[PDB]
Amino acid sequence: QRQTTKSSKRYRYSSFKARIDDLKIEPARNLEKRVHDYVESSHFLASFDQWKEINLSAKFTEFAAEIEHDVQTLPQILYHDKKIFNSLVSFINFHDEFSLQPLLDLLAQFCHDLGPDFLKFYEEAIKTLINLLDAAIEFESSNVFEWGFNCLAYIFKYLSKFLVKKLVLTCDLLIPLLSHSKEYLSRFSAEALSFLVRKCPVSNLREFVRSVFEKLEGDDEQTNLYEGLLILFTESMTSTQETLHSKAKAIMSVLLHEALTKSSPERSVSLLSDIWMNISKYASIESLLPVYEVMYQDFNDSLDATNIDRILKVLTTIVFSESGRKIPDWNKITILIERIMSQSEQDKVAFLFALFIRNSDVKTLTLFHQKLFNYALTNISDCFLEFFQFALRLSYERVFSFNGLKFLQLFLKKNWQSQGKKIALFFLEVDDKPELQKVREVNFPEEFILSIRDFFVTAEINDSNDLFEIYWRAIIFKYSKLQNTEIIIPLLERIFSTFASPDNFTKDMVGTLLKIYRKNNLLKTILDNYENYKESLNFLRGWNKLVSNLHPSESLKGLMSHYPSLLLSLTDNFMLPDGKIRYETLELMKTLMILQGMQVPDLLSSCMVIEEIPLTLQNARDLTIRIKNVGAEFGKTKTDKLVSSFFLKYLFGLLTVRFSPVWTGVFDTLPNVYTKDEALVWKLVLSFIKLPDENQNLDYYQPLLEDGANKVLWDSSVVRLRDTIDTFSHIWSKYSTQNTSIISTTIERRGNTTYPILIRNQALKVMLSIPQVAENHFVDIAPFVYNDFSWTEVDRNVFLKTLSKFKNIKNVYSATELHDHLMVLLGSRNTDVQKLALDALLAYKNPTLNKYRDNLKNLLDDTLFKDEITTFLTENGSQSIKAEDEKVVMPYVLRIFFGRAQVPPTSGQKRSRKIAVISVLPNFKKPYINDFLSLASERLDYNYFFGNSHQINSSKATLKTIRRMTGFVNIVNSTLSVLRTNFPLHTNSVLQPLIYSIAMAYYVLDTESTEEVHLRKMASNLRQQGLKCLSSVFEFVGNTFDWSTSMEDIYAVVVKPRISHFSDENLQQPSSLLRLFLYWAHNPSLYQF
Amino acid sequence: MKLNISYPVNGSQKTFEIDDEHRIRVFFDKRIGQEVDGEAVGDEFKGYVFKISGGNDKQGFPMKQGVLLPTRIKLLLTKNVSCYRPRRDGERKRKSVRGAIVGPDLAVLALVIVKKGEQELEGLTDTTVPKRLGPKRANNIRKFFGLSKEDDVRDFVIRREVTKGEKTYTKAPKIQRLVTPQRLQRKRHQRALKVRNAQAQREAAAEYAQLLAKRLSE
Amino acid sequence: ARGPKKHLKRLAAPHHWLLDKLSGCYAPRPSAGPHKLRESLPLIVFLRNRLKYALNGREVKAILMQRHVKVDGKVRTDTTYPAGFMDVITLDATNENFRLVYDVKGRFAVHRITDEEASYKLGKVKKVQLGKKGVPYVVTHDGRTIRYPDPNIKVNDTVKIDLASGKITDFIKFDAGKLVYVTGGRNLGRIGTIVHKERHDGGFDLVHIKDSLDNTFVTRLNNVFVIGEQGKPYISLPKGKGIKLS
RNA sequence: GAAACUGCGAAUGGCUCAUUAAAUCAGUUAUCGUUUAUUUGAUAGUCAUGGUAUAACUGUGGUAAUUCUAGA
RNA sequence: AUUCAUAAUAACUUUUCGAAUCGCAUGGCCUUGUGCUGGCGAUGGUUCAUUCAAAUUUCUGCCCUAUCAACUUUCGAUGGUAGGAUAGUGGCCUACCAUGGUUUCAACGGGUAACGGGGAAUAAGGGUUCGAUUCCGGAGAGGGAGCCUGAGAAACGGCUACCA
C-alpha cells in the first residue's frame, strides 16, 4: 500500500525510494517554455547564461570563469569544441551535485548545438555519464538520477538518426548498466532506449532485435537484463497514455518474426510473451485489434515449422492474458487451434486446453468443445487425466454443463490399463471436494472392474507393498456398482488374521474396504476386530457407512446385545485430540445406540451439536454457554457409567481441542462431576501428565523413490501467470510422482492425533482445581518429584501450588522424601520456587514453623530483608530464635540463605544484599554454619576423587559444574574474609571440594586446548580464587587444627602444576601460592611441606 | 425500583422494575459487595444468587462504595476514583454522592449475577453477545489460541470480514509486541555502538596519556 | 510573572540588533543555547534583516525545513537559534561561509569566509576543571566542553578548534603584547594589543590595551578576548580592522 | 483518519495599581549559602524480547438539571 | 581564600540508572542458516557544563508629621548553642541560653484621592511640579483562609472552606 489518500498538509516526508518509484523521464511527456527552446542566439549560450544566473557553486563558478572566457558564440563553439568538452568532463568527474545539474544541462544543449559531429565525444561521454550514475547510486539523489536520465533522453532526441543507424552499438554502451543489478537504473535506461526503439526504422529494428536475442543467449544467466528488455519493448509499445499505436504494431511484427525464427531463444519467446501480456493489460481492445490481426497473419504465415511448441506457448499466453474482454475472436483462435493440431498430427497443450475451457465463450465452446475433447483424447492421452484435473480445478461447472463425465468415460474405455495408478490418483482426490457428485456418480470400465475383482481374488497380502496395491485397487474399486460384500469378506478376515498389530496404513486401507461396502457378517467381523482397528478415521468412516447402510433388526439386536464393550471402547475413542474423529465416533455411537435400543440421550445429541459448531470469536460466548449447558445437564441428570465415561472423555477431547473459551467452559464444568466419577478421570488426567514426553511415532509405509518432475513450462515474470504455471507444475509433479502422492494425500486425509505439549499444563490446572484426588493417590506423581523431571518452570510452579493446596500433607505417600525435595527447591535460587516451597513447608504443620511463619515470610520478602535480618537473626535481641526452635527450623534458614547467596551480584543492591548475608553469617552457631558449608559442598561433589585417589571418573569440565565451583569458591573467599579467625573448618565440608576445585581448574587448563577461551578464562579465575582462599584459610587458621591427613594430597596438588615452574611464573608479584609457601616455611608445624 | 441485572458470563444485561416491598426488605440494610438470594427476591430467580454492584438514587446520585452511610455526601474526589472524570491533571473537586449502604431512595439498584438458579431468564441467560475485541499483544493471542513458542501468529490473526457495498474486505490489527529481524538489527546496532564508543574512549584516553607522559618527560 | 516568559517586546531588544520600532511590537525571543541573551542573534533576524533573503517567518521556516544552513557543521531548525559572536555560518546553495564577529560600530558583523577558515573556529577557554574519574577538561566562551586539553592552557585562553572534529587545533596563552578583541563594553570591537592587566584580588581586573594608532584604553577581562600575536591573527579580519575614527 | 489513551503547553500574553513610605524601585553587589523542565556541549561494556491492565468502543441505567454519571 | 575540583577506604538504601522504543530504506557477508554483520534519523536516559532562569544578599537613596520622645522584647524583640524545616543561609521555627537592639544625625507611630523608575512640563539658572498610562520592576485578579498537579502557581478563563 502506497499513499493513495492525500492529506491536507503542504509537505510530505517522501522517502527516496518513493521518489524513485514516482520518477519518470520523458520531457515530451513533459514540456515547458525552455529557455534554449525560447531564445535562439545559441542554445548552449542561452542555457549557460541561465545557469550563470541560477547556480552558485564554486565548481560551476570556476567552470563558468573558464568557459565565459573561452566561448561567446557558435563559431567559438566550433573552434574550441574539444577544450570546452574536456573542461566539462573535468568538472563532471570533479563530482559536485550543485554543479552537476547545470553542467548536465549544458551538456544536453551542447550536444543539441553540436549534433552530427558530436559522436566522438558522445561515446566517452556515455562512459563518464554511467560512471556518474554509479556515483549517484553511491549517493542518494533522485534529483541527480532525474537530471542524468533527462540529459540522456535529450541527447537521444538530438542525435536520433545517427544512433538509429548505429543502434546496436548504443545498446552495448548501456548493456552493463542495463544488466546492472538495480531495477530502477534498468527501468530508466529502458525508458530512454525505449524512446529510441520507437524511433528506429524497420531494418535496424530486425537487425538490432536479433542481436539482442543472441546477447540474451550469451547472458542467459542474467534476469535483470531480461526484465530490462521486457520493460524496454513494453514501454516502446506503451508510450502513450492508454493506446498502443501503429509503430507499436510494427515493432510487434518485427519482434514476432525475429522470435518465430527457429534459432531464436525460447527465453526470448517468454520475454515476448510477457511483453504481450503487459501490453494486453495496459491498452484497450480498440487500440489492440490491428495488433491481433497482424498476430493472426504471422500465425497463418509461420504456422508450419518446428517451433509449434513456441507458437503454442505464445498462444497459451494470448488465451490466458486477461479474458475475452480483449480477445476479439475465439473463433479465429479456434481456427488456429485446428491449424496447430493438424500440424502436430503435451503439457502446454493441456494447459492451453484448460485455459480455453475456462476463458473462452460458451457460444464458441458449444461447437469447439467436441473438437477440443477429441483433440485431447487423441493427442494428449496420458496427459488427459492431468488436464482434466486441472480443468476441474479451473472451471468444472463449464464442463459439467458440458459433458465432462461422458468424455471421461470414453477415455476410461479407450484406456484403463496404462495409467491405472494415475486413475486412482484422480479418483482419490475427488472424494474430499463435495462439488463432485457427478464424479462420484460416474461409471467405470467393466473389464477394468472385473480385473480389479480378479486381482482381489488372486491377491497375496503378506507385504506392505501388497497392502499398497490392494488399497489402490480398492480406491479404484469404489464405484464397482456390483454386489461386492462377500468378495470383501475373505480378504477382510485374511487381513484380520494376518495382522494382529496393524499399521496405520493397514487400518486406513481396511477402512477404505469398509467404504467399498455398498449393500451383516461383515458387521460381525468388524465387531470382532475393532479392538485392534480402533483409532483411524478411514476405518471410522467405512464403519459408519456400514452402520448407516444397516437397518435395526432383531437378530442384529441379539448379536449387539451379545457384544458388550462397544460403547466403552467408543468412549476411549472419544478420548482423542481430533475433533473430526471424535465427531465420527459420536455419530457412530449414536447410530449404534439406535440399532441396539432407544436410550439415545440429550447429552450425546447436544455434544454432537457442540462439535458441529465452528470456532469463531463471535461463536465463543455461544460455545462456552453450550459447554456450561451440557455440563449442567450432565450434573443434574442421573448417570450411567457408560455415559459418565462418555462425558468425561468428551470433555477431555474439548481440552485437546485448542480453544480458550472452551478451556474456560470445561474448567467450569469438571469440578462438579469429578464427584460423580473421580476414578476414571484420575487415569485421564494422569495420562495427560504422561502425555507428551512419551514418544509419538506415526510411522507410515513409504514407497520407493520416483524422480518424476520437469520444467514443463517456461519461467514467467507476471505474477498471475507465475501462479498459474506453479499450480499446473505442482499438479504435474504429483501426477508424475503418482506413487508417493497417493501416499501423502492419504496421510493428508488420515488426520492428526498428536497431542499438544500444553496438555500437560492443562492437566496441571485440572490438578490445581481438583486437589483432593491428587491428595488421594499421590503414588504416580511421587516419581515425577523424585526424578525431578525436564519440565517447564511454570509446570513446576503450578505443581508446587497444588502441593500448597494439598490438605492432608503430612500423610502423603513419601512425606520425608517430599520434604527433602522441598528443602532442595527452597535452597534453589528461584525465589518463586522458594515461596512455593515455604507454602508447602507451612502446609506441613509444626508449631515452630507456625511460630516463625511470618518471620520466614518477611525473610523471603525483598524490601524487608536486611531489616528482618538485623531484627530477629541478631543474637541476644528481641524476637531472637529460641534454642529448640532454632534447632528444629535451622535447615530452612540455611536454604533461604543459600538462595539469597545464590543471587548474582548484578548491581550494588544485589551485591550489598549478598554482603549482608555473608556478614550476618558469623553469629549463628558452629554446626549450623558448618551445615551451611555442608550444603555449599553438597551442591558440589568430591566422591569421584575420593572414591578414587586423584583420578577423574568422568571428564566433566562443563560450564555448569565449574560455575557451581566458582560460586562455591567465591562464597568460600567471602566466608574466609568475614570469619578469618573464628570459623570451623571441616575436611569433609570445606577441605575436599576446594582441592577438588583447584585440581579441576588445572585439568580444564591442561586437558583441553587453548581454543575454549571462556572455559580457559574461567579456568584461570578458578585457579586464582582457589589458591587465593587456600592462602587465605592458611593464614586465617594457622595451627588451630591438625594438617597431617590431607597433607600428602594437598602437597600433590601443589607439586603437580606449579613447582616445576613456580619460579618462572611467580616473580612479578607475590602469588597466593607464594604466601602459602611462606606461611609453610614460617609456621614450624608446616615445615613438612 | 429498577433492578439493572447483569449476567457477565453472557455479557447480557436487562432491567426489572419492582413495585412490592418484601424483596426490598430482603434487600434492606445491605451494601455493595454483599450477596443476596434470588429466591428470597422472588419466584423466577429461584436458586439464583447475586451481589450488589451499584445504584443511582431518585435524583440520579449514584451509590459509591467505601462510604458507610445510606445517604449522600460531598467527598473531595481525586483522580483515580469512580464517579469522577477530571478535565484537568490533578483535578480534585468535591462532589455530592449517594452512599454505599442500601436505602429505599435508590431509583436504580444494579445487581450482577453470581450463581444461576434453575430457570432461564430471557434477556440474560437465553442469549449472549460475543466480545467486541480480541487481544492485540502477540503473547496474548498466543495464550488465546494456545499458540506454541515456535508458532507464528500472523497466520492466526483474527480478521473481521467487512463489506462496503460489493467490495468485501477484511480488517486485522497491528500485532504489537512483535519480535522482528529489524528489532534484531536495532539491537545489533545498539551493541556495536556501545562497543565502538568504548574502543574510541579507550583509544583517546591512551593517546592523551601518551601525550602527558611525553610532556612530563620533557 | 509566575515563571519565565515567551515574549520579547520591540523595545526590549538589545540596541545593537538595529531593529526598527515600527514593523513589530515584538522581537523574536531567542531560544536558549550556547551564548547568553543580549550578545546573540536569532537566525531569522540575521537572514531577513541583514541577508534579506527571506522576508517572512513562513519563508525562513520553509528554509529551515529545507535543511540548508549548518552552524559549525550542524544544521539547526530553530528560527530563534541564539547565534553569537565568532560563529561559522555555512551556506551550501550559495557556497559561502560567514564569521559572525562584532562591528566597529558596536554591532555585529557578517564576514565572507572561505571553507578553510570555516573548517576551524576560535574560542575563549573560560573554565578549566577536573571532572569525575579525575578527567581534565575545559569549557570555552561558546560553551564548548572539551575533555583532555593541553595542560599548559589555563582559563580565558584563546584556542583554535577544528570544527570538523570538534578538536583542539592549537592554543594561545594570555600574555602582554598579544592581539586582543574586545567583545563587550563601550569600546567593543576595537581590536588592539594588550598593554597589561591591572589585577585585583577577587576584584574585576582591568586591562590596558593599545591599538595600532597607539591608542590606549582599559576594559575588563570578560570583554578581553585575545586573537593572536602582533600582526598574526589566526582569522581574517573585516575592513577597518577594528579601528575607531572621527 | 473521528474518537480515545500517551506527550507537552496551558505558571507567558492581556488588564489594573487596591495594597505597600527603606517596603518596592533604582544603581551597585554577591551567593565559596540555592535549584533549574527546556537549549547546547560533552558523558555509561561492569531475550529470537514477561505481565497487568483500562480508555476510546459494544451493551443495561439513573435525574429537573450541569463538560454528572453507575453497572457490565 | 576553602573540608574545593578530584582520588581512596568501610558499609548503607521500603535501591536510581546502565534503551524489552520507533520511522526510512536496505547493503555486506558467508559455514546457504530464512545464520552472521551493516546506513540514515527519532525518542528516551545518568552525570557535568551551558543557556534561560528563579530564590536569597551588600552599599546608597524615600513625602509630611515633635500640639508625635522614647521605642521592641508574655506572644522573638537583640545575640548564643542544638535541632528542625528548606532547594538551600537564616529565630524561619523550636528548645536551652545570655539582654539586648534603635533613637533629637528624629527612633517609633500617624497622614498620604504614595504602584517605583526611565521620563513630562516649566525658568536663564538655581529650582518647582507631575509621571495609572506604549519599556522595565513588583503586586493583584469580590475579599479572608488553604491546597493539588507540574521544572515552574499559593494559579484565580485550577481546586477546598468563609463571608458577601
Tab-separated table of N, CA, C and O in Angstrom, chain A residues 266-267 269-271 273 313 348 711-717 721-722 725-726:
chain	number	residue	atom	x	y	z
A	266	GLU	N	14.114	-19.502	-26.675
A	266	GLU	CA	12.809	-19.663	-26.045
A	266	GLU	C	12.682	-18.791	-24.802
A	266	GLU	O	11.567	-18.442	-24.397
A	267	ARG	N	13.813	-18.411	-24.203
A	267	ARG	CA	13.783	-17.377	-23.177
A	267	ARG	C	13.319	-16.047	-23.761
A	267	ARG	O	12.519	-15.333	-23.144
A	269	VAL	N	11.374	-15.938	-26.295
A	269	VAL	CA	9.965	-16.191	-26.586
A	269	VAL	C	9.112	-15.888	-25.363
A	269	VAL	O	8.054	-15.256	-25.465
A	270	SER	N	9.572	-16.317	-24.187
A	270	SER	CA	8.887	-15.968	-22.945
A	270	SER	C	8.935	-14.468	-22.701
A	270	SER	O	7.992	-13.884	-22.153
A	271	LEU	N	10.036	-13.829	-23.100
A	271	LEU	CA	10.145	-12.380	-22.976
A	271	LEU	C	9.095	-11.680	-23.827
A	271	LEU	O	8.405	-10.765	-23.362
A	273	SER	N	6.348	-13.065	-24.756
A	273	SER	CA	5.055	-13.427	-24.196
A	273	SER	C	4.683	-12.502	-23.049
A	273	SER	O	3.533	-12.063	-22.937
A	313	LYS	N	3.144	-21.856	-27.021
A	313	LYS	CA	3.470	-21.083	-25.831
A	313	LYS	C	2.888	-19.678	-25.904
A	313	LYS	O	2.196	-19.213	-24.982
A	348	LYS	N	1.913	-28.143	-22.338
A	348	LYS	CA	1.367	-26.851	-22.733
A	348	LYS	C	0.065	-27.012	-23.505
A	348	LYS	O	-0.789	-26.123	-23.464
A	711	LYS	N	10.488	-29.153	-15.855
A	711	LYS	CA	10.152	-27.752	-16.103
A	711	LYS	C	9.259	-27.734	-17.338
A	711	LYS	O	9.690	-27.467	-18.462
A	712	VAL	N	7.980	-28.031	-17.107
A	712	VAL	CA	7.068	-28.331	-18.205
A	712	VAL	C	6.667	-27.061	-18.936
A	712	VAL	O	6.204	-27.105	-20.084
A	713	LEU	N	6.831	-25.913	-18.291
A	713	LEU	CA	6.566	-24.628	-18.908
A	713	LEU	C	7.741	-23.692	-18.680
A	713	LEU	O	8.584	-23.908	-17.804
A	714	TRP	N	7.777	-22.644	-19.491
A	714	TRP	CA	8.767	-21.590	-19.374
A	714	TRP	C	8.603	-20.831	-18.060
A	714	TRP	O	7.549	-20.857	-17.418
A	715	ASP	N	9.664	-20.128	-17.678
A	715	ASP	CA	9.650	-19.276	-16.498
A	715	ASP	C	9.041	-17.924	-16.844
A	715	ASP	O	9.475	-17.264	-17.795
A	716	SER	N	8.047	-17.513	-16.068
A	716	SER	CA	7.323	-16.273	-16.294
A	716	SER	C	7.848	-15.172	-15.384
A	716	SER	O	8.711	-15.386	-14.528
A	717	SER	N	7.306	-13.974	-15.581
A	717	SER	CA	7.571	-12.847	-14.701
A	717	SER	C	6.309	-12.188	-14.178
A	717	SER	O	6.305	-11.715	-13.040
A	721	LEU	N	0.397	-15.229	-14.089
A	721	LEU	CA	0.814	-16.345	-14.928
A	721	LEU	C	1.803	-17.222	-14.185
A	721	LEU	O	1.820	-18.448	-14.367
A	722	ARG	N	2.621	-16.609	-13.324
A	722	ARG	CA	3.520	-17.376	-12.472
A	722	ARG	C	2.742	-18.296	-11.542
A	722	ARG	O	3.082	-19.467	-11.392
A	725	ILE	N	1.220	-21.241	-13.681
A	725	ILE	CA	2.178	-22.266	-14.074
A	725	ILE	C	2.682	-23.008	-12.846
A	725	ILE	O	2.996	-24.199	-12.920
A	726	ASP	N	2.760	-22.328	-11.697
A	726	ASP	CA	3.116	-23.015	-10.460
A	726	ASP	C	2.074	-24.057	-10.088
A	726	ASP	O	2.421	-25.180	-9.708
